[PDB]
Each structure stands twice: as structure tokens, then as C-alpha cells.
Ligand code: BCL
Ligand code: BCL
Ligand code: BCL
Ligand code: BCL
Ligand SMILES: CC[C@H]1c2cc3[nH]c4c(c3C)C(=O)[C@H](C(=O)OC)c4c3nc(cc4[nH]c(cc(n2)[C@@H]1C)c(C(C)=O)c4C)[C@@H](C)[C@@H]3CCC(=O)OC/C=C(\C)CCC[C@H](C)CCC[C@H](C)CCCC(C)C
Ligand SMILES: CC[C@H]1c2cc3[nH]c4c(c3C)C(=O)[C@H](C(=O)OC)c4c3nc(cc4[nH]c(cc(n2)[C@@H]1C)c(C(C)=O)c4C)[C@@H](C)[C@@H]3CCC(=O)OC/C=C(\C)CCC[C@H](C)CCC[C@H](C)CCCC(C)C
């Protein structure tokens with residue numbers, strides 16, 4: 042009968058859709074690897090899919106996936122155990138090294154462009170004519186680290202222009218240089234910005250950017266990695 | 282409970298976003314409407330602009346027509362009394378024609394004719410809007426996924442109000458326009474068909490409805506968790522993967538043994554949702570055209 | 584075993600309990616203290632459902648069912664074969680679920696992400712706990728909980744429903760359904776928008792988030808934004824479940840009559856309770 046036929050058909054359709062869904066989702070990260078970076082012996086039942094090509098705008102590159110990949114960076118990690126499945130101890134300082142929770146990715150060393158080919162992110166002081174329009178304005182507040190010491194003061198907000206939201210606080214350090222702080226990791230209070238991830242002596246260590254007026258994708262990832270990284274690695278200085 | 286990212290600490294504002302042009306006839310765009318500080322804590326502050334358009338106006342005109350046809354009848358049930366209308370608002374009902382008129386358009390206004398009028402308006406209202414989601418897509422040079430997904434919703438609705446009634450051979454099978462009346466119709470439908478818990482498509486549809494809430498809570502929370510790396514910039518993470526797309530997949534992988542990619546997560550999503558009404562529409566279409574009783578059918582698969 | 588970029592993330596540290604004792608993977612799966620906790624509670628619970636099957640003398644998945652105590656036992660313990668087994672599996676399930684969340688917290692700690700995922704999961708947990716613990720306790724008997732069978736849980740849904748008439752008239756049930764419906768609408772739209780920008784017309788360049796805001800604004804005169812929509816999805820599905828728990832928490836405790844009859848407070852309001860005509864007068 043037709044009802045019984047429909048339900049059995051649908052199940053077959055469902056096995057096939059999951060099949061497609063699973064393969065679509067293997068366009069990055071595969072084939073799987075041993076802890077040593079070589080193709081793993083057992084890959085599972087799903088094959089890699091046929092390649093596809095994204096063409097980016099403003100002639101910003103084009104991408105085909107899946108395809109061989111490498112980290113494009115060196116990884117200061119070493120084995121702690123004689124078999125599969127254990128952790129890899131940083132061979133250095135994981136903060137500086139870009140490993141663990143402080144990991145970052147070799148993304149393109151250029152700024153994200155908007156639909157009109159302008160830098161998506163800019164300092165407010167250089168984006169006609171953006172302004173804090175509601176809420177507490179952080180520009181001018183002292184920045185306190187998680188050791189309860191002042192690390193510097195907030196001199197600007199870096200804004201996503203097309204989206205119209207605040208992405209970074211630009212912070213002046215006691216030597217006169219600045220670093221970018223993820224907005225998404227600061228607590229704006231009445232009389233300060235409090236930053237839990239970092240202790241005040243880790244700020245000088247934040248990654249710096251090549252130009253006062255734009256941030257690249259790679260620059261972004263390094264800054265974001267380093268700051269999140271402090272949650273675990275600053276932790277000794279907590280301690281309060 | 283650190284900085285927990287459901288509401289924004291600081292809002293900013295700049296020159297107004299009139300938006301992408303591509304092949305969009307700019308004469309048809311309203312200006313930007315008001316800014317809401319209230320929205321700005323949660324989403325965007327900017328209201329507007331909207332694209333007017335011919336199809337847009339046909340859609341919006343016909344839509345109101347529908348809403349008004351139903352409303353005009355409710356005032357007639359309220360005896361033209363404002364207090365009665367307000368008291369019995371959810372009890373009013375624009376019911377289809379009686380079984381005997383079958384599939385014909387010759388029902389009296391007070392006897393299923395107004396329902397057919399209102400349905401006609403509803404029908405052009407939806408389909409004209411569907412063509413919209415395609416066109417606004419086309420003007421910007423975009424994929425057709427929205428019109429595609431929308432079609433799955435339109436499928437359930439068509440089956441309920443149009444396709445099944447025609448296959449039963451009468452408009453009395455269709456759904457009345459009323460708040461509570463539409464709920465009673467629903468319950469009755471199940472009762473009069475052996476209980477929809479025995480319809481395999483009802484339980485598939487539930488699985489997907491539940492699964493869409495499972496999936497959206499997973500996606501929503503995941504993105505908020507990695508937004509300290511700008512993970513909510515999903516198109517840029519597709520073209521040039523960052524550590525947010527990486528920690529995201531590694532969470533799921535270490536948790537449950539597999540993971541998605543920024544692009545493929547959005548493929549799971551569309552299907553999770555479109556399957557709801559897809560399986561549901563088939564469920565309802567078979568009911569009474571092919572199976573009077575799902576329990577009985579259940580008890581043999583035959 | 585590893586994704587091509589996984590290794591730099593598998594460092595020591597994170598765990599809530601036990602220092603480095605349980606800090607390792609198995610295949611792709613992170614273990615942790617709560618991984619071991621999860622396994623212990625889940626095997627126990629499965630062994631006992633296996634025992635339940637043996638005692639009722641079947642192996643058919645469509646007929647194994649684990650029933651709570653009979654009502655006359657109230658909130659007390661019950662002999663194993665008369666709902667004690669149900670009580671112990673319920674403890675197992677809970678410990679399994681809370682452990683799963685807690686393991687997720689260790690994974691968060693390790694990766695340096697926010698705790699949003701497990702927090703969102705706790706909402707599902709509390710829905711379950713409402714049906715098997717908060718509602719039975721407030722009703723005064725374990726027997727009001729649902730049975731653990733693939734088909735028998737549906738009977739339970741259905742009887743609970745029709746005890747109060749058409750359950751559709753639960754106000755909280757209605758707010759709940761609006762959310763599941765809206766959550767799905769949003770899921771489909773989010774999906775469609777991202778993909779349609781990622782996958783433009785033949786031979787065009789990948790669209791940008793500006794095209795995305797634009798299409799949606801062109802369509803409905805608003806756009807919530809990239810951060811916005813992920814907050815929205817989360818809100819819609821959590822609110823969906825919160826109102827579910829709420830609609831069941833009030834049922835049979837503060838309201839145990841026909842739901843349809845609750846609506847009479849509006850109809851019977853003194854200013855119009857008596858005007859002839861319309862539906863109710
Ligand atoms: C799937 C099985 C049943 C069904 C099952 C039920 C059940 C059960 C419930 C609903 C509920 C809803 N149903 Mg129904 N109902 C269905 C058919 C539909 C159809 C349709 C096919 O056109 C429509 C328009 C409605 C719409 C309505 C809404 C009033 C309500 C919330 C839906 C929602 O949040 O969606 C998505 C949200 C949106 C953003 C758009 C929707 C906005 C609303 C306002 C538009 C609908 C009609 C509108 C004219 C409302 C009038 C307002 C008053 C004059 C004040 N139903 C089919 C026939 N529906 C719930 C309810 O609370 O009912 C009282 C509920 O418990
Ligand atoms: C939620 C409100 C009601 C509910 C009423 C409904 C109704 C109505 C229906 C279901 C149906 C489902 N319910 Mg129920 N059911 C509830 C209680 C739950 C609970 C629980 C609280 O622990 C569980 C595990 C289940 C699970 C089940 C599944 C068998 C089925 C598909 C769900 C789904 O795709 O979800 C979405 C989640 C996913 C897509 C992820 C996968 C989850 C599933 C596949 C895992 C569960 C497997 C199951 C055999 C668990 C046994 C434990 C074993 C050790 C594995 N229900 C409460 C009491 N449920 C439908 C059905 O067809 O059943 C016959 C159906 O029509
Ligand atoms: C007593 C009642 C019966 C019941 C009988 C029904 C019936 C009848 C149906 C369902 C169906 C549904 N049932 Mg049931 N079912 C019951 C038990 C339940 C239970 C439970 C016990 O917990 C659950 C979880 C479900 C849930 C499910 C859903 C999967 C499904 C709703 C699909 C949907 O998203 O439509 C919501 C969306 C739509 C209806 C599409 C609407 C799309 C567009 C076209 C509307 C546009 C409107 C616009 C013009 C106006 C808006 C104004 C705006 C402001 C602009 N049922 C019991 C057994 N159920 C449906 C189904 O498919 O089942 C197979 C269905 O027909
Ligand atoms: C005849 C039946 C009645 C009625 C009976 C009632 C009853 C009774 C209930 C509902 C409730 C539900 N009803 Mg109703 N309702 C009906 C009509 C409908 C209709 C419709 C189309 O008319 C709809 C859409 C709904 C839908 C709603 C939802 C709001 C709600 C279910 C979701 C939920 O609570 O999740 C909650 C989520 C969970 C409990 C799942 C959590 C599971 C997690 C913690 C763990 C699972 C892990 C494990 C098992 C997985 C296995 C491991 C594997 C390896 C994967 N009802 C009809 C009128 N309704 C229920 C509710 O509000 O629930 C509290 C409820 O009890
Ligand atoms: C995958 C299944 C889910 C789904 C999919 C889905 N729905 C969708 C979409 C898709 C992806 C569409 O793109 C389309 C959309 O544009 O969304 C923004 C839509 C849509 N689904 C909608 C609602 C809806 N979908 C349904 C649900 C679902 N949709 C499922 C859960 C339901 C439920 C669950 O009950 C509802 C009620 C609309 C938001 C929209 C369809 C728009 C439409 O057809 O409109 C036609 C009629 C009008 C143009 C106006 C209607 C008349 C009004 C009563 C008055 C006008 C109000 C207006 C807003 C103000 C104007 C005032 C002026 C006069 C000044
Ligand atoms: C809060 C919004 C929605 C939501 C959220 C949510 N669910 C989630 C997550 C979150 C974000 C988790 O991170 C977690 C996950 O890891 O997902 C991949 C999860 C999860 N929700 C799941 C399923 C699920 N979610 C549900 C739905 C919901 N989850 C809500 C709709 C439902 C529904 C709607 O029916 C189900 C079936 C799992 C896939 C996963 C949790 C898996 C897990 O906790 O694993 C550890 C525990 C075991 C391995 C089981 C232990 C064995 C028990 C002792 C025996 C089981 C007894 C049980 C009571 C039997 C009942 C039988 C039924 C027939 C009734």
C-alpha cells in the first residue's frame with residue numbers, strides 16, 4: 042500500500058541525506074592524522090567529498106576544499122606519554138608559542154573587507170561618525186588586570202562598521218604603546234575596565250598590530266588566542 | 282558568571298546603512314526607520330529600510346484583505362458590538378463550506394462562501410510573498426536557499442488548506458480561521474483518524490521539531506562560546522578558517538566523537554528545520570486519502 | 584584519530600576533579616573525571632534496564648518498558664520489580680546527564696571557550712527533572728512520572744493530556760508551542776541566509792554579511808545581526824523548554840481541572856459577562 046511505500050522510501054532518503062551531510066562536513070580537518078601529523082590508518086566509513094571552490098570578493102583569494110593542509114606555523118608541543126591519547130606539554134611558554142587555549146591560526150595577513158571593499162574594522166576616532174550611543178562609555182577608564190593592578194587606560198573603541206558593534210578596546214600601556222583587547226573579554230564597570238583573562242604584567246605581552254588604523258585577520262587570531270590563553274596560564278596569578 | 286554575552290555592554294552608532302545595491306532597483310527602498318536602544322542590547326538597533334515593490338504591494342494588499350475578511354465576519358458574529366467582539370475574540374470562527382457543497386464555489390457568504398473568498402486572498406498573499414524571497418535573493422546575486430526552505434513550510438500549509446481537501450473532495454475538510462477553532466480542528470483531526478501517534482510521519486516530524494530546538498541551542502551556544510574569537514563571523518570563517526571555527530569543532534568532537542564545519546553546520550540546520558513540515562505534510566496528505574486509521578494501519582503495515 | 588589542526592589544542596589542564604589522573608582522549612573522545620563518572624552511571628543504568636527486561640521476560644525494544652511505582656506507594660521506596668528499578672535508573676540517568684554537562688565544562692576549560700553550551704544543556708536536564716522529580720514530588724507520588732519505554736511514554740503523554748481535556752488549552756503549553764514553531768522558522772532562515780551568501784549564483788563571488796543584512800532587510804525591513812541571530816536561536820529554544828517545564832509544573836499542582844475551563848475568567852469579567860449575542864452570550 043501507498044503509506045507503507047512512502048515510509049520505507051523516506052528512510053532510504055534519510056540514510057542518503059545523512060551520508061551527504063556527513064561528507065559535506067569533512068571539507069576541513071580531513072584526512073585524519075596520527076599524533077605525528079601523518080595520515081592515520083583508520084579513516085572511518087565516509088569518503089572525502091569532491092572539491093568545491095569559493096571565490097572571494099575584491100580579488101581577495103579563492104578557496105578549494107577539501108585539499109591538503111598544513112598548520113603553516115611551527116608547534117612547540119611534545120609528547121608526555123609512550124602511547125596514543127595523552128596530552129602534549131608545551132616545550133616553551135604556551136602564551137608566546139601560540140599553543141593550547143592560546144592557539145591562533147595562520148589566517149590571511151590582510152583585513153576583512155566589507156561589501157563595499159572598505160576595512161570592516163576601524164578605530165572609532167577614525168570612522169566618520171561613529172559614537173557610543175548607549176551604555177557606559179569605556180573611553181578614558183583605567184584597565185585593571187586580574188591581579189587587581191592597573192595595566193593601562195582605554196583610549197579608543199575599534200568598531201565593526203557594517204554590523205555597527207564594538208569589537209576591541211584600544212588600551213594605552215605605561216610605555217605609551219597600545220594593544221587591542223577583545224570586547225568580548227572585558228568587563229566595563231562604572232570606574233574601570235576589568236579584564237579577567239590577564240594579569241597586568243601580561244599586557245605588554247599582547248601581540249601588536251602593524252598599522253594604527255587596521256587589523257588583519259591573522260593579527261586578530263593572535264590577539265584573541267593570547268588573551269583567551271590567560272584564562273588557564275595566568276591562573277597562578279589568582280592567587281587572590 | 283564573568284562577561285557572559287547575552288546583552289551588549291556598549292552600543293555604538295554610525296551613518297546609516299542603506300545596504301548593498303547589486304541589481305536592486307533602489308527607487309523601491311524606503312529610508313531607514315527609527316533606531317531602538319532596546320533592541321541594541323540584544324541585536325541591531327537599526328530599523329529599515331524595506332524594499333516596497335510591485336509583488337510586495339500585491340502580497341501585502343492581499344494579506345490584509347484576508348486578515349480583514351476574517352475580521353469582518355467576527356464583527357458580524359459579535360453582533361456589531363465592541364464589547365462582545367473583545368470578549369469572544371478567540372471563540373469566533375470562519376468555518377469552511379458544509380460537506381454537501383463539495384468542492385464547489387457556490388456556497389452562500391454566510392455558509393462557506395466568505396471562507397473561500399478569504400482563502401483566495403490568503404493564497405495569493407503567500408505565493409506572491411514566496412516569489413519575493415526568490416527575487417530579493419536574485420537581485421543580490423544570492424543562492425535560492427530561502428525560497429527553497431520556505432517552500433517546505435508552504436507544502437504543509439497547502440496540504441492542510443488545499444490539496445487534501447481537494448483529494449477528500451470537499452472544502453469541509455479544510456481548517457477554519459479561528460484561534461480556538463483551529464485548535465479543536467487539530468485535536469479532532471487526530472481523533473477522527475485513529476490517533477496521530479500511530480502515523481510514522483507524525484513522529485518523524487516530532488523528532489525534527491525537537492531536533493531543531495536541540496540543534497539551534499547547540500549552534501547558538503557554540504557560536505556565543507567562541508565569539509571571543511569572532512566566531513559569529515561565519516562567512517569569513519568559511520573562506521578563511523580561524524581558531525574560533527577550530528575550538529568549536531573540537532568541542533563537539535571531544536564531546537560526542539564527530540563535528541561539523543562552519544559551512545556544513547548551516548547545512549544540518551536547513552535540513553533539520555525543513556524536514557519538520559516535509560514529513561509532516563506527507564503525514565497529513567496520506568491521512569484519509571490513503572489511511573482512515575493510523576492505529577489500524579499500524580497494526581498490519583498494509 | 585586527530586583532525587589536521589587538533590594537536591596544538593590537546594595540552595594538559597582543565598579538569599575539575601583529579602588533576603591529571605583522567606586527563607586523556609580515547610579516539611576522538613575526551614575522557615576526564617566526569618567522562619569516567621558518565622560511563623559508571625550509564626553502564627549501571629543500562630545493566631538495570633537489561634535486568635528489567637529479563638524480569639518482564641522480553642528483549643523486543645518496542646516492548647521493554649520501565650514503570651514507576653504504583654500511586655499507593657507515594658514518595659516512598661518500592662520493591663525492585665514494582666518500581667524500585669525505575670527509581671534507581673532515574674538516579675542513574677540524572678547522574679549520567681549532570682556528569683555529561685560537567686565533562687563539557689572540562690572541555691570548555693581545556694579549549695578556552697565560554698560555558699554557553701553546558702548551560703544550555705542544563706535547561707534540557709531540568710525539563711526531564713520536572714517530569715520525573717519536581718512534578719511527582721509536588722503531586723505526592725512517584726507514580727505520576729513517565730514510564731521508560733519507546734511506546735509506553737507516548738501513552739503516558741496522551742493520558743496526561745486528556746486528563747485535563749484538550750491540553751491545547753494550557754496557556755503555558757501555547758506559549759511553549761509558539762517558541763518551538765518560531766525556533767524552527769529561525770533555524771531555517773539562519774541556515775538559508777548563510778548558505779545562500781556562501782553559495783551564490785553560478786560563477787558569482789561569495790556574498791558578504793552585508794548582502795545578508797541587506798537581503799533580510801529588503802525582505803522584512805529588519806536584520807538582527809550575526810551576534811544577534813545566534814543569541815536569538817539560543818533564546819528561542821531555551822524559552823521553548825522553560826515554558827514546557829512551566830506548563831507541566833503547574834499541571835496537577837496549582838491547576839488540576841479541565842484546562843478549557845480556565846478561560847472562563849475572561850468571558851465572565853463583570854463588564855461584559857452579560858451582553859447577549861456573539862458566541863458566549
Ligand atoms: C500544526 C498543527 C496545526 C496548528 C497547531 C496549533 C497549536 C496546537 C498551537 C498553535 C498555535 C499557533 N497557531 Mg496554529 N496550527 C496550525 C495552523 C496554523 C497556521 C497556518 C497553517 O496558517 C497559522 C497561521 C497558525 C497560527 C497560530 C498562532 C496564533 C499560534 C502561534 C504560531 C507561531 O508562533 O508561529 C510562528 C511565529 C511567527 C513569527 C508568526 C505568527 C504570528 C501570529 C500572530 C500569526 C497567526 C495568526 C494571527 C492572525 C494571530 C491573531 C492575533 C489576535 C487578533 C490578537 N496556525 C496547524 C493546522 N497552532 C499555538 C497557539 O498559541 O495558539 C493559540 C498553539 O498552542
Ligand atoms: C518531550 C515531551 C515528552 C516526549 C513525548 C514525545 C513524543 C510525542 C514523541 C516522542 C518521540 C521521541 N521520544 Mg519522547 N517524550 C519525552 C521523553 C523523552 C525522553 C527523556 C525525557 O529522556 C527521551 C529520551 C525520549 C526519546 C524519544 C525518542 C524515542 C523519540 C525521538 C526523539 C527525538 O528525535 O528527539 C530529538 C533529538 C535528537 C534528534 C537526537 C537523538 C535522540 C534520540 C534518537 C536518542 C534516544 C534513543 C532512545 C532509544 C533512548 C533510550 C536510551 C538508550 C540507552 C540508548 N523522549 C517527554 C515525556 N517523544 C517521538 C517518537 O516517535 O517516539 C515513538 C514522538 O512522536
Ligand atoms: C490532540 C492533537 C494531536 C496532534 C495532531 C496534530 C495535527 C493535525 C498536526 C500535527 C502536526 C504537528 N504535530 Mg501533532 N498532535 C498531537 C501530538 C503532538 C505533540 C505532543 C503530544 O507533544 C507534539 C510535539 C506534536 C507536534 C507536531 C509537530 C511536529 C507538527 C507541527 C508542524 C509545524 O511546525 O507546523 C507549524 C507550521 C505550519 C502549520 C506551516 C505554516 C506556514 C505558513 C504558510 C503560514 C503563514 C501564515 C501567514 C500568512 C500569516 C501570519 C501573519 C504574520 C504576522 C505575517 N504533536 C496530538 C496527537 N499534530 C502537523 C503535522 O504535520 O503532523 C503530521 C499537523 O497537521
Ligand atoms: C494528547 C497529547 C496532548 C499534549 C500532551 C502534553 C503533555 C503531557 C506534555 C506535553 C509537552 C509538550 N507538548 Mg503537548 N500536547 C498535545 C499537543 C501538542 C502539540 C500539537 C501539534 O498539538 C504540540 C506541538 C505540542 C508540544 C508540546 C511541547 C511544548 C512539549 C514537548 C517538548 C518538551 O517539553 O521538551 C522537554 C525536553 C525533554 C524532557 C527531553 C530531555 C532529554 C535529555 C535531558 C536527555 C536525553 C539523553 C538520552 C536518553 C539520549 C540517549 C543517548 C544516545 C546515545 C543519543 N503538544 C496534545 C493535545 N504535551 C510536554 C512538556 O511540557 O514537557 C515538560 C509534556 O509532558
Ligand atoms: C521550516 C518550517 C518552519 C517555517 C519555514 C519558513 N517560514 C517562513 C520562511 C520559511 C523559511 C519564509 O522565508 C517566510 C519569511 O519571509 O520569513 C521571514 C516565512 C513566513 N512564515 C511566516 C509565519 C509562519 N510560518 C510558520 C512556521 C514555519 N515556517 C515552520 C516552523 C507558522 C507557524 C508555525 O504557525 C507561521 C505563522 C511569515 C513570518 C512568513 C510568510 C510571509 C507571508 O506569506 O505573508 C503573506 C501575508 C502578508 C504579506 C501580510 C499578512 C497580513 C497580516 C495579518 C497583516 C500585515 C502585517 C504587517 C507585518 C504590517 C503591515 C502594516 C502596514 C499596513 C502599514
Ligand atoms: C534545551 C533545548 C533542547 C536541548 C538542548 C541540548 N541537548 C543536548 C545538548 C544541549 C545543548 C548537549 O550539549 C547534549 C549533547 O552532547 O548534545 C550533542 C544534549 C543531548 N540531548 C540529547 C537528546 C535529546 N535532547 C532533547 C531535547 C533538548 N535538548 C531540548 C529540546 C531530547 C528531546 C527533545 O526528546 C532528546 C531525546 C542527547 C543527544 C545529548 C545528551 C546525551 C547524554 O546526556 O549522554 C550521557 C547520558 C547517556 C549516554 C545515557 C545514560 C543511560 C541512562 C541511565 C538510561 C536512559 C534512561 C532514559 C530515561 C530512558 C527513556 C527512554 C525513552 C524512550 C523515553
Ligand SMILES: COC(C)(C)C/C=C/C(C)=C/C=C/C(C)=C/C=C/C(C)=C/C=C\C=C(C)\C=C\C=C(/C)CC/C=C(\C)CCC=C(C)C
Pocket residue numbers: 348349351352353355397400401403404438439440441442443456457458459460463
Ligand atoms: C479590529 O477589527 C478589524 C476588522 C479592523 C481587524 C480585526 C481582525 C481580526 C480579529 C481577525 C483575525 C484573524 C484570525 C483569528 C485568523 C487566524 C488564523 C488561523 C488560525 C488559520 C490557520 C490555518 C490556515 C490554513 C491551514 C489554511 C490554508 C488555506 C489555503 C491553502 C488556501 C487554499 C485556497 C482556496 C480554498 C481557494 C481556491 C481558489 C483559487 C483560484 C486558488
Ligand SMILES: COC1=C(OC)C(=O)C(C/C=C(\C)CCC=C(C)C)=C(C)C1=O
Pocket residue numbers: 768769770772773776796799805806807808812
Ligand atoms: C536570518 O536571520 C534572521 C534575522 O535576520 C538577520 C532576523 O532579523 C530575524 C527576525 C528578528 C526578530 C525576531 C526581531 C523582533 C523585534 C521587533 C519587535 C521588530 C529572523 C527571524 C531571522 O532568522
Ligand SMILES: CCCCCCCCCCCC[N+](C)(C)[O-]
Pocket residue numbers: 311312313314315328329330331803804805
Ligand atoms: C518581522 C519584523 C518586523 C519589523 C518591521 C520593520 C518596519 C519597516 C520600517 C520601514 C519604514 C521606514 N520609515 C519610517 C522611514 O518609513
Ligand SMILES: CCCCCCCCCCCC[N+](C)(C)[O-]
Pocket residue numbers: 480481482484485488492552553
Ligand atoms: C537531520 C537528521 C536527524 C535524524 C533523526 C532520527 C530520529 C529517529 C526518530 C524515530 C521515529 C520513529 N517512527 C515513529 C518514525 O517510527
Ligand SMILES: CCCCCCCCCCCC[N+](C)(C)[O-]
Pocket residue numbers: 059063084085086087538539540
Ligand atoms: C541526527 C543524525 C546524526 C547522525 C549521527 C552519526 C553521524 C556521525 C558519523 C561521523 C563519524 C566521525 N568520523 C569517523 C568521521 O570521524
Ligand SMILES: [Fe+3]
Pocket residue numbers: 500504515547773777813
Ligand atoms: Fe550560524
